[PDB]
């Protein structure tokens, strides 16, 4: 601790007085991830193995809530033709707790791959569907030219070429009727320099990339404060209180001492927060319990030592903490070790603070 002052002062000669060096902190001794048992598994493989999807504007969706979803089967690595994801892959999504999940399924063309992206425009992006800028999920694409393609074109799937206005992200228009194409309203049936807005795909197994269909699956993720009953392979991880640990509770990952409190929460209220809008007390997602989040102990380190030419005696002063582990004394400033307490009063030499001073004597 004397050498900590030497590197703090950037010199080998420590002058007589009190000097601040470092900051002590209690590190977490364990990791407690507490979540109840799993209910079912998400159809992660059924959306990829489905026989046929919907069109781009008609896209079908399967809503699966209460994450974590099924992490066992993961096709994110070299399974399909095109894998473009944001954030972390579903391999790392097993540690995240999301409220609702929207699985979108639609088939696009070759030149339409660049048009599918969050916050990006395009022919089918504006006129059919656009991914929202809040999209945290993965965009999966595979080459269906050996299946969905038909001789002479596949007209089952449809796409809207023209529309009176551009669709906002996360908006659905299924209308197949005849509407205004250009700037001149043609009053229904095609004519008067307008065009039939809906169009059929030309999927041909024998043509190039532009005419090749690509099955695209979009997993839309929504994170809220709602509780999550499934996180990772480890569920219970039996609770240990009165210790500094790394906790993950209802999808909230943090480090702090876990202490039981008398705080009364309403049945719909999952967790509280303090004046700083940070996690204060959370409730057990498994059983009925209310647990308080206590920050682990920390504070500043003060070194009380005389001059280098005096002696090597060093008195370490901890700021605002009581030392229960451990010449161990306690003052209003905190734990003070390496010094002796004299009931007599002397002139202040090296101030400790709170009306107490330290000195080097016999």
């Amino acid at each position: 601790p004397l050498s900590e002052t030497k590197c703090t002062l950037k010199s080998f000669t420590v002058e007589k007085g009190i000097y601040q060096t470092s900051n002590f902190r209690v590190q977490p001794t364990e990791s407690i991830v507490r979540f109840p048992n799993i209910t079912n598994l998400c159809p992660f493989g059924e959306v990829f193995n489905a026989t046929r999807f919907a069109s781009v504007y008609a896209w079908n969706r399967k809503r699966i809530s209460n994450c974590v979803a099924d992490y066992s089967v993961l096709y994110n690595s070299a399974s399909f033709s095109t894998f473009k994801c944001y954030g972390v892959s579903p391999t790392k999504l097993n540690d995240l707790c999301f409220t609702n999940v929207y699985a979108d399924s639609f088939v696009i063309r070759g030149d339409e791959v660049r048009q599918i992206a969050p916050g990006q425009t395009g022919n089918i992006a504006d006129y059919n569907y656009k991914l929202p800028d809040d999209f945290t999920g993965c965009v999966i694409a595979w080459n269906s030219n050996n299946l969905d393609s038909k001789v002479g074109g596949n007209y089952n799937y449809l796409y809207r070429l023209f529309r009176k206005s551009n669709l906002k992200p996360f908006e659905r228009d299924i209308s197949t009727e005849i509407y205004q194409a250009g700037s001149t309203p043609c009053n229904g049936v095609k004519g008067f320099n307008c065009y039939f807005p809906l169009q059929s795909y030309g999927f041909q197994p024998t043509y190039g990339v532009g005419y090749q269909p690509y099955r695209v699956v979009v997993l839309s993720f929504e994170l809220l404060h709602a509780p999550a009953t499934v996180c990772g392979p480890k569920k219970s991880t039996n609770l240990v209180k009165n210790k500094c640990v790394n906790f993950n509770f209802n999808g909230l990952t943090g480090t702090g001492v876990l202490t039981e409190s008398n705080k009364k929460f309403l049945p719909f209220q999952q967790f509280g927060r303090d004046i700083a809008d940070t996690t204060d007390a959370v409730r057990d997602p498994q059983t009925l319990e209310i647990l308080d989040i206590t920050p682990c102990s920390f504070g500043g380190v003060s070194v009380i030592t005389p001059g280098t030419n005096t002696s090597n005696q060093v008195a370490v002063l901890y700021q605002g903490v009581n030392c229960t582990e451990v010449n161990v004394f306690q003052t209003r400033a905190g734990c003070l070790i390496g010094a002796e307490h004299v009931n007599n009063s002397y002139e202040c030499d090296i101030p400790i603070g709170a009306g107490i001073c330290a000195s080097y004597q016999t």
Partner: peptide, 28 residues
């Protein structure tokens, strides 16, 4: 004229004064 302990949790440390109020009354 606690807010002290609440702010000490975010890393804001309130240092105790060297001169106590009882010693202030003695100088007075």
């Amino acid at each position: 004229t606690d807010l002290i302990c609440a702010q000490k949790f975010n890393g804001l440390t309130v240092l105790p004064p060297l001169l106590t109020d009882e010693m202030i009354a003695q100088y007075t």
